[PDB]
Amino acid sequence: LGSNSQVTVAVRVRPFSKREKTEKASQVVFTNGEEITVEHPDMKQVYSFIYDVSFWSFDECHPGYASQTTVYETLAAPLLDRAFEGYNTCLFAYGQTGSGKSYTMMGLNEEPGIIPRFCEDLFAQIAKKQTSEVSYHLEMSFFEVYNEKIHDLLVCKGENGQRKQPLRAREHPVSGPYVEGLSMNVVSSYSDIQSWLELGNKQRATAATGMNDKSSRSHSVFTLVMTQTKTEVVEGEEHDHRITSRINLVDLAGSERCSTAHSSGQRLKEGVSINKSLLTLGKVISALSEQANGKRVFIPYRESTLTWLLKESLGGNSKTAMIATVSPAASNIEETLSTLRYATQARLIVNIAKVN
Amino acid sequence: MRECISIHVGQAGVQIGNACWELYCLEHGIQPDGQMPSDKTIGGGDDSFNTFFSETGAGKHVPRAVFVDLEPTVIDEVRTGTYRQLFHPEQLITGKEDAANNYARGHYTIGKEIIDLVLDRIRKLADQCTGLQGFLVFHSFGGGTGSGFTSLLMERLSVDYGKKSKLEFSIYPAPQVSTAVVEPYNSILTTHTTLEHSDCAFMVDNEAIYDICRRNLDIERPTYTNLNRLISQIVSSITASLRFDGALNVDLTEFQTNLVPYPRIHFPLATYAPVISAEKAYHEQLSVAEITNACFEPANQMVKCDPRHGKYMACCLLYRGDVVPKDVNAAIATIKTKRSIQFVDWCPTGFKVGINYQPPTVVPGGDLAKVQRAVCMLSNTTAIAEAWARLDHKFDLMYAKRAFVHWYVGEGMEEGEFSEAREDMAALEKDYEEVGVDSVE
Amino acid sequence: MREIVHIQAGQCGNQIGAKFWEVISDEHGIDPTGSYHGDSDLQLERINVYYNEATGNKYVPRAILVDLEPGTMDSVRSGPFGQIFRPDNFVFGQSGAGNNWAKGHYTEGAELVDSVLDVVRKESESCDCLQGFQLTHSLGGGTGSGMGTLLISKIREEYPDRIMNTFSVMPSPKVSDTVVEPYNATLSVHQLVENTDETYCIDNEALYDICFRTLKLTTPTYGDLNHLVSATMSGVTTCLRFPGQLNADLRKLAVNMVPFPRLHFFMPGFAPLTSRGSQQYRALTVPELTQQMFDSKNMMAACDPRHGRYLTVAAIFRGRMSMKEVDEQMLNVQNKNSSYFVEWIPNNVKTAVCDIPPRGLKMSATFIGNSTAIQELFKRISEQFTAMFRRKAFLHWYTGEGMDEMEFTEAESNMNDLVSEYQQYQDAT
Ligand SMILES: CC(=O)O[C@H]1C(=O)[C@@]2(C)[C@H]([C@H](OC(=O)c3ccccc3)[C@]3(O)C[C@H](OC(=O)[C@H](O)[C@@H](NC(=O)c4ccccc4)c4ccccc4)C(C)=C1C3(C)C)[C@]1(OC(C)=O)CO[C@@H]1C[C@@H]2O
Ligand SMILES: Nc1nc2c(ncn2[C@@H]2O[C@H](COP(=O)(O)OP(=O)(O)OP(=O)(O)O)[C@@H](O)[C@H]2O)c(=O)[nH]1
Ligand SMILES: Nc1ncnc2c1ncn2[C@@H]1O[C@H](COP(=O)(O)OP(=O)(O)NP(=O)(O)O)[C@@H](O)[C@H]1O
């Protein structure tokens, strides 16, 4: 079997920040309805790109406004139905420091993002479809990459400061890669999923920097396991065959130029690592794009933990989506273009999905 | 008086500095110990000229130089050499590690730990200098210290000093010959950071000089010394109008006002025509006409480009020795008659001329002859774009696959920093095309 | 002060290293007691790269020797140049590995890696600025491979910003010396490819060919091969210990020769070798050294570059020579033989020159090549591996010491993926 499924690519333009208002960088980015085009401030070679979905939250009032729950019901809700059809799901973000990846995926206390909405919709839509025909089983995993190391977000540490216990990745011959030691804890409803997200977004590495004071210094990956029985009636015992889902929602860190959000030591070490990671991922995307157009290429999954564990998601067997974040200021021009250009590569990538 | 602070940034720079300082010492009369025996006979004179040397009451002449390499192997050859008693001992090595052919190491990880000290010694020097005209930096696109450290320093000096001249002498990479598989990148990025700070970046290349030394001087196996001695001579022509007397003198503030039309097209090329051996030193008249024509021959350039594929925007011609000016005017007119030397429509003058009465000094052990007159030509042309374009092509062939990039990101550089750079250089290339288009009414 | 800390593990490692110290003592003028008995001053300017001063102008090296059995350790002591090593840096236990990787990585070697790391931390904090490490070991056994790889892991954890170079005798295609070469080699590749920054691959058939059809020696003992490996070891690190017109430390070489992080496996070579009778029939100049260095008969990797393409080549010259010669001849190599060089790297060459050559020659050169042909090695191992792993040929000696088949499958996958990387740059488009 097989299904040539493309990766659905969304883009969002975040509004101004406070420092961006101080230095007064005026509008450079524009949405022609859904098409996105950018303007160097010296009227230089106006650039234009097109994407499967766009979002313009630059101001609450403009026509074409597009907010958190719209992003949700446009991309994440489809993927929930696919997670119900019998597949695994990968939506992954990209951007730079202060660009809104954390706001778009997870969100704030009052205005939460794709993660709680996916979970809540899953629970409500399950309890609407939970009868003695098909049961439902759930557990949650949430991990982070920091300085090339893996760490479990839902495991509180014991009484000593550096107790941040690292794990290791391993390659199962059929199932592909995985993480050893991941305290995948068990859930039934929305409340304990919420307590887990609490403990995770608290344990995630953050730091104050020269762009946002609650910056993200770690990649974060969100994967719930959701099993629903396939109710056979056979000569013997029933209900043994089963249809599974594993989620993937990925919130990455920023590119971190070392002169603007500048620091020395640890705050500079981790930055390097982040960028290294990002670089490798770019190659993968680029490479996969060439793979869709006949070129004979090799995907360097193994030069990073992130792209190594997402091997069956960037290609492989999952329903796929990218989300890019951009800011409206000249400061970001090439970075934005880098962002935008990577999406246009991710538009062209196709993987093979299968019912579980 | 008129004073200059030479800065030698890297291996190429230090070795060129050694050549230059040997020659300046020979010209003025300074022994390597710092002593000038010339006042043994003539009292009340000035030959240990204050532009390049500083005098203590004890009769010494210490240079105004700053040497910087981020590796001890090259300055220690001075400290333990024949010129150990000349340079101030503060020759800056924090060279516990070099830059590993990396602008990222030379601009951020090991770009710092030394630069504050550098600026301190520069400040100490300039405070001793009353009438300072500018700096002259010697570096090399191809390394780290010569690519990134130079950039950082230029950035800082464009703040701390400002309205001073900051000229450069660089070894531009060659199209074929090269000693590094990371040169293109470093070149592009250095050009990005320096175009907004430097004022005139004289460029040389070693392939051209190899070929010169082959044809004219009859050396088929030359080393690096035999090259830098030529480069030394070039500076000695630029710097003569501060040190020696003359008819028409050119200070450092007079190049960049004539050889630089727009602020981004300040990449001129050098040449020095009578690179003639002692055998062939005879059989030649060595007149102004011969030399001025030679300085326009493409085969006598020091940057591998053909001016016949482009247009001259300006040319400064610096003459040394027995030269009468009528001969210059006749020579330049001959050149302006020729149709192979195609000047722009918006520079109907084109030329600048400077003359000095002190002829060149033959370094003993050398490969060039004693001439009565010598000439150095600094020319701003459009051909060098081709050269720039070549680097850009190389860049693409590598950056399309992100080769060698994880060494840069590893030393605190964002991927985008590359792209920006390339785009800027593209602009520059477009700007060169804008200056070749004939004007319309 | 760019300093190196030198480790050497196992029989091969210790014998090579001993022959190495007897080659970098001869260059630096140190005697078997530690004292300086030299000619020049430049021998002492930069001796700190490898040695430390002790008391009476005696120089004690920064050697860390490791064995899981004491038989090889007693030979270095009871030998020429053993009375200069620091006795507290002979870290050796009993319970040999058994030509088994497990006993060196998990059982007996884990009972001794802490000792080695203590000696390291002593010989790494007594250094003003460390450039990195270098290990001489042997893929093919247990102690060298196992304990070495483990130490690599632990140093790249403790000292991450630094170099970890390696000189490794890789297995040979025709004849072996252990029946469990494949497994151990695959696991060592799995643990090196992720950790090291340069891996210089040596193969003994290449060195026997060198000793046969070039040097024309009828009795090639191992002391001769190690004398060829030492020659490269010295050539790689010259420019940190002698001056030159154009210098090249290790990190520069790596930056130029490592485009992607995992393809850091190099075919080495040294020139000039003249057999003792073809001395008076051969001129000593750059064209000859270049003709020899780029010949497949002078390379140590046992892999014909003519079956691939050179991603990146490096030439460290020693002697008074013209740079024009080097640049010209290199460009000539690239142009005449363009089918053996990558197109998306315009200049595939790196040059270094030093001024102080070897004791008996006017000119010397070392060559480091990154070519795709290295696949021909690993590919073979994988074939061997799977031809055994399909039947559980010898695995019960491994599982019995705390291992699982998962690691074997992992290592196979990694090595094959590496082969594939080196393949995608083999054809001409
Ligand atoms: C009459 C004469 O010319 O003797 C030469 C000689 O002819 C040849 C054979 C020497 C000779 O090398 C060998 O015979 C040999 C034997 C087994 C394995 C490898 C080589 C020589 O033994 C080797 C020796 O090499 C050196 O002198 C270097 O200093 C060499 N020294 C050592 O390796 C060394 C070993 C143990 C103890 C002390 C020094 C060296 C090479 C590389 C790096 C550092 C040092 C030299 C010049 C010669 C003889 C003696 C014949 C050559 O050796 C090297 C590596 O340069 C082989 O080709 C070179 C030059 C000559 O062909
Ligand atoms: N003309 C000339 N060029 C030189 C000389 N020495 C080195 N070069 C050139 O310098 C380039 C490499 O730059 P380097 O000076 O070696 O780099 P660096 O400034 O030392 O910086 P590092 O690599 O970190 O040591 C090469 O392309 C050479 O052509 C020299 O003596 N004369
Ligand atoms: N679309 C939006 N509309 C309004 N406010 C936003 C929007 N996106 C982000 N913000 C605010 O921007 C602030 C910083 O954004 P943030 O989500 O931290 O960026 P980020 O994705 O975390 N990048 P990094 O921290 O480097 O990973 C948050 O406090 C949000 O409240």
Ligand SMILES: Nc1nc2c(ncn2[C@@H]2O[C@H](COP(=O)(O)OP(=O)(O)O)[C@@H](O)[C@H]2O)c(=O)[nH]1
């Ligand atoms: N070049 C060289 N190779 C050696 C020497 N001794 C052993 N070997 C090689 O080492 C391999 C076995 O490694 P070994 O030294 O036995 O590892 P150990 O038993 O774990 O210490 C074989 O393939 C040999 O070819 C030596 O002195 N020189």
Ligand SMILES: [Mg+2]
């Ligand atoms: Mg964030």
Ligand SMILES: [Mg+2]
């Ligand atoms: Mg250097």
